[PDB]
Write a protein that binds this DNA or RNA. Structure first.
Lengths: 207, 241, 253, 60, 41, 236, 29
RNA sequence: UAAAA
């Protein structure tokens, strides 16, 4: 199933109809005959067969991750994906965040601050696993904390829907007094403490 | 032209008119039924003004919207070919133009029943094809006749008249040559009344003479109202029948 | 415990739904179109089943209004609350003494009461009519067969009828009593058009009549007889000041 | 801006503003006297949405 | 629809089951060439 | 019992051994864990054994910060679906006044408040990372007297020092010198708002002019002569 | 390390202890 | 579009 050249450039024909995929499109060509459905690669990289797809970059560019900002922009967070966010705004019934990474482990750095970055919203009904109706988001998150939350339904009119109703989901990195203190570590399920400063702050820990 | 007589002892001005005579008034209604809901081609003397009224409609963005009244926008665009010498400047963003655009909005937002049209915006687009003195007053009469064509509820007419004072003699409807030789006053009279929605004085006038200038100014403005009113009578009668 | 008034009626209530609603009208006073052609079923156009039309449909869209509502006249204050007693209407003779009193006026205030816990469609229980001098309380349980005489006043264009949120009172007057209103002045739609924060009747009594009311008898069983002392005063208050409120709202409108 | 009638026994409708017990017109058009409802029908009038109208429109 | 309608006690009503067949942007595949020239006329 | 003028960055004249209950003006560093002033004002302390000691700094300010258990006057600027939107001070952030934060509150009936209405409420939530919240009834004790709409009258803009010295310090000779001239009712707001109201407008205006003149004048013993001349001026 | 209680507002520091009337109506005189 | 009982 692999007679084609290794690398592929935008415009190089692959195989007839096989099914398309990431990096291909059914383009009908004409060579003094009937139009044949030819699958044409539209990316610079190597062709892979499973399902026909053309992945961008060389094998050295994938291990060294030379396409860091190119990988996250091409792979949008789909349904059920687990991402890493940063708290930006705290509302009474929600918590606006900012998507910073996404995994399939391995991740992908987002866009470098200025706007036009992927943001989400963690509803109060999906903060904890028990007592989903009455929660206190002020006791769960603070602005400037890295939160690991899994996405939910994609009503992406502007934001995303996330949840932390599990044990491995919640605040994974924070600092005392919203960055004015020391690096805190998650001890209990809802108790975070910094060793040096000794102060405790109530979070939605993940351990 | 040259060194002319502004007001000779024979009572005749440089263009032949007399002290209380107006330039020819030829207004036109519904000149752009394909570009705006309101239209008025004002031809007061040499002046040729195109006024469009687009609305009342939804605003292009929900940011600016008054939930209790309407938004009145006026866009006065003086073309480069408005005078004999083609203008080299930009004119659009000129500080003198922004003052006129604002003075027109305040003048009509109190006369136009913006409450009847809440959560809406009324855009007024003006293009001056030619000017020759008294351009402010002709801008007034154009907006009045353009809103009426759009079916916008107003309390009364708004008339624009320009009056100049040469020594001790007022002059109605001043042209460009007369404005460059004496003080100018543009009035904004409401209907057949003496209520002034606009009073612009841009040159020195003795206090002992201003009252008489205002009286002769509002008197000529009523005459401007009738010429606009008679234009609507003729336009409505020929349209129904 | 109070027994159901449905059992003491002249005839049981048609709960079969074997035919569309037949209007309970036999006399149509103050009518522009005759009652004859109003008793024919409208052919089921599109997918609206055949149904008898509103008997006073044409009488509402075309009849003129009384010159009393187009004017801006000085408001007349409501009669003193303590120096005035209601007039309970319980017999046909007492009903006649009120109808001819309602024919010699121009503004009346009407309100109804309803019960729908021990009845399917429900039954009216008390009508609250009040004029500029008197306040009436009509027992719609015994006079149910006699209240259709009131159409002489409720359909008189010269007389103004002042309700409040009559979106259900119009349905009850026609379903249980065969009554219809021509010349309606709903004060709810007046408060909704003025721009008041709330549109309840308790709001208009505390701001336009200064009547501190205790709204707790709405969900009461209005079938008990006789009515208690607090409810008899609670029922008359819904229409006592409603005529002075109509004057204040009309002039503002 | 003109006076249409001085009779207070009228119902002010669309294109009409009440003032000092006298009725004036707010737009330019014809006078309509249906029952006691006094209104002015303007020349160039847009679409007036009424209850129970079959219309066609695109999502904005 | 416009062709079949425009030209020619224990019941408490039921709810109609309507799918997204009327919301699909997919137009009719084969429209008559003689019919499209009538729409332009 | 010590009161001395301090400055931001100066040493704190309190021993670390003694238990302390700091308040406004004093900050705790999240790194050095030391206690340092951040405001310029008089440092007030009070050592009592019953055995807790408190310390705070009284500084001059005009921008109000929402703090819990405060009596504030606000203006209703928006009506949402489940709460109001009140403005405790111009340019400052908004506060939340829920419809359920009223005497005899219920889901069935909404409060009769509309926009532009002056309300008197108690700050029940003053979180730094959240929007502040107010309520027209003390949700901790059940009190509700005085809270509600302040119909008519006139509001006065004063600094925060003039508001606390008028609500808490009962020795402030303002309500006493004003009541000696005309009968009135006052509403003291810690956000720098003083709402007054009299029978006649001439008396309400005279109360507006005295509080304004007494707000800028620091001499407390001159309040008697201010109202003596102010209430005499309105007689012409 | 110190004996720290959260920074309290201006009202809780006073002595009346919440028995204060913010809206005092001065009747007569 | 928080009116009616």
């Amino acid at each position: 199933n692999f007679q084609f050249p290794e690398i592929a450039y935008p415009g190089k024909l692959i195989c007839p109809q096989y099914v398309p995929g990431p990096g291909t499109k059914l383009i009908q060509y004409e060579h003094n005959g009937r139009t044949l459905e030819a699958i044409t690669a539209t990316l610079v990289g190597t062709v892979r067969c499973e399902l026909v797809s053309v992945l961008p970059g060389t094998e050295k560019g994938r291990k060294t991750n030379k396409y860091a900002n190119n990988d996250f922009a091409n792979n949008l967070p789909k349904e059920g994906d687990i991402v890493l966010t940063r708290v930006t705004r705290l509302s009474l019934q929600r918590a606006n965040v900012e998507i910073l990474a996404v995994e399939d482990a391995t991740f992908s750095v987002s866009q470098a601050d200025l706007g036009e970055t992927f943001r989400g919203i963690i509803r109060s009904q999906d903060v904890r696993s028990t007592d989903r109706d009455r929660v206190k988001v002020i006791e769960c998150f603070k602005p400037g904390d890295i939160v690991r939350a899994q996405v939910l339904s994609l009503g992406d009119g502007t934001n995303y829907y996330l949840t932390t109703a599990r044990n491995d989901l919640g605040v994974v990195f924070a600092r005392a007094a919203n960055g004015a203190g020391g690096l805190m570590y998650a001890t209990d399920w809802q108790m975070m403490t910094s060793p040096v400063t000794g102060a405790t702050e109530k979070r939605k820990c993940a351990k | 032209m040259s060194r002319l007589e502004i007001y000779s002892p024979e009572g005749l001005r440089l263009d032949g008119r007399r002290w209380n005579e107006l330039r020819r008034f030829e207004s036109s209604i519904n000149t752009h039924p394909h570009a705006a809901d309101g239209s008025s081609y004002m031809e007061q003397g040499n002046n040729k003004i195109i006024t469009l009224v687009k609305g009342p409609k939804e605003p292009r963005l929900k940011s600016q919207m008054d939930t209790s009244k309407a938004l009145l926008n006026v866009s006065v665009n003086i073309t480069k070919f408005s005078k004999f010498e083609r203008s080299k400047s930009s004119h659009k963003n000129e500080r003198r133009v922004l003052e006129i655009q604002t003075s027109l909005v305040r003048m009509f937002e109190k006369n136009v029943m913006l409450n009847i049209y809440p959560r809406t915006v009324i855009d007024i687009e003006i293009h001056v094809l030619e000017q020759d003195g008294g351009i402010m007053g002709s801008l007034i009469n154009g907006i009045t006749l353009a809103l009426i064509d759009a079916g916008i509820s107003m309390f009364d007419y708004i008339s624009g008249i320009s009056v100049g004072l040469y020594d001790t003699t007022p002059l109605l409807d001043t042209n460009s040559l007369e404005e460059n030789a004496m003080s100018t006053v543009t009035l904004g009279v409401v209907g057949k009344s003496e209520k002034l929605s606009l009073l612009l004085v841009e040159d020195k006038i003795p206090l002992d003479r201003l009252e008489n200038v205002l009286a002769i100014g509002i008197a000529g403005a009523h005459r401007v109202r009738d010429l606009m009113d008679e234009e609507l009578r003729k336009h409505a009668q020929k349209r129904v029948s | 415990m109070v027994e159901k008034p449905q059992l003491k009626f002249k005839s049981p209530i048609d709960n079969s739904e074997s035919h569309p609603f037949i209007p309970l009208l036999k006399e149509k006073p103050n009518a522009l179109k005759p009652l004859s052609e109003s008793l024919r079923l409208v052919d089921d156009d599109e997918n609206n089943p055949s149904h008898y039309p509103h008997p006073y449909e044409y009488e509402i869209d075309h009849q003129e209004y009384s010159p009393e509502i187009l004017q801006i006249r000085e408001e007349i204050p409501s009669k003193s609350w303590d120096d005035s007693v209601p007039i309970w209407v319980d017999t046909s003779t007492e009903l006649e003494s009120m109808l001819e009193d309602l024919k010699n006026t121009k503004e009346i205030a009407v309100n109804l009461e309803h019960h729908d816990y021990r009845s399917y469609y429900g039954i009216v229980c008390l009508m609250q009519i009040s004029t500029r001098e008197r306040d009436y309380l009509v027992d719609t349980l015994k006079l149910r067969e006699n209240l259709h005489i009131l159409n002489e006043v409720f359909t008189n264009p010269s007389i103004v009828k002042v309700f409040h949120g009559a979106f259900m009172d119009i349905i009850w007057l026609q379903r249980d009593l065969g009554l219809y209103v021509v010349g309606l002045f709903d004060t709810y739609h007046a408060s909704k058009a003025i721009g008041l924060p709330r549109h309840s009747l308790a709001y208009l009594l505390e701001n336009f009549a200064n009547f501190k009311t205790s709204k707790k008898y709405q969900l009461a069983d209005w079938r008990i007889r006789p009515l208690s002392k607090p409810m008899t005063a609670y029922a008359r208050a819904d229409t006592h000041f409603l005529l002075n409120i109509y004057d204040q709202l009309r002039n503002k409108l | 801006g003109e006076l249409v009638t001085d009779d207070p026994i009228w119902m002010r409708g669309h294109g009409t503003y009440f003032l000092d017990n006298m009725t004036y017109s707010s737009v330019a058009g014809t006078v309509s006297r249906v029952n006691r409802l006094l209104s002015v029908i303007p020349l160039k009038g847009r679409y007036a949405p009424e209850t129970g109208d079959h219309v066609v429109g695109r999502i904005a | 629809m416009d062709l079949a309608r425009d030209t020619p006690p224990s019941i408490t009503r039921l709810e109609e089951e309507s799918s997204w067949q009327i919301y699909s942007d997919e137009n009719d595949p084969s429209i008559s060439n003689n019919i499209r020239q009538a729409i332009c006329r | 019992h010590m009161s001395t003028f301090i400055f931001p960055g100066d040493s704190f004249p309190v021993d670390p051994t003694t238990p302390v209950k700091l308040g406004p003006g004093i900050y705790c560093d999240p790194n050095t864990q030391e206690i340092r002033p951040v405001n310029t004002g008089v440092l007030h302390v009070s050592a009592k054994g019953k055995g807790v000691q408190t310390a705070y700094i009284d500084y001059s300010s005009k921008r109000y910060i929402p703090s819990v258990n405060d009596f504030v006057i606000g203006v209703i600027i928006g009506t949402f679906s489940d709460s109001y939107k009140v403005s405790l001070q111009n340019f400052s952030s908004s506060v939340s006044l829920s419809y359920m934060a009223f005497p005899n509150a219920s889901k069935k009936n909404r409060p009769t408040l509309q926009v532009g209405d002056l309300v008197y409420a108690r700050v029940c939530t003053a979180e730094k990372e959240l929007e502040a919240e107010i309520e027209c009834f003390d949700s901790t004790t059940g009190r509700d007297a005085g809270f509600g709409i302040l119909e008519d009258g006139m509001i006065i803009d004063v600094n925060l020092n003039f508001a606390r010295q008028l609500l808490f310090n009962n020795d402030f000779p303002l309500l006493k010198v004003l009541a000696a001239h005309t009968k009135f009712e006052v509403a003291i707001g810690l956000n720098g708002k003083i709402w007054v109201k009299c029978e006649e407008l001439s008396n309400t205006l005279a109360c507006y002019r005295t509080i304004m003149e007494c707000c800028q004048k620091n001499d407390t013993a001159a309040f008697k002569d201010i109202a003596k001349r102010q209430f005499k001026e309105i007689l012409t | 390390p110190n004996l720290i209680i959260s920074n309290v507002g201006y009202s809780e520091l006073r002595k009346p202890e919440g028995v204060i009337s913010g809206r005092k109506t001065f009747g007569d005189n």
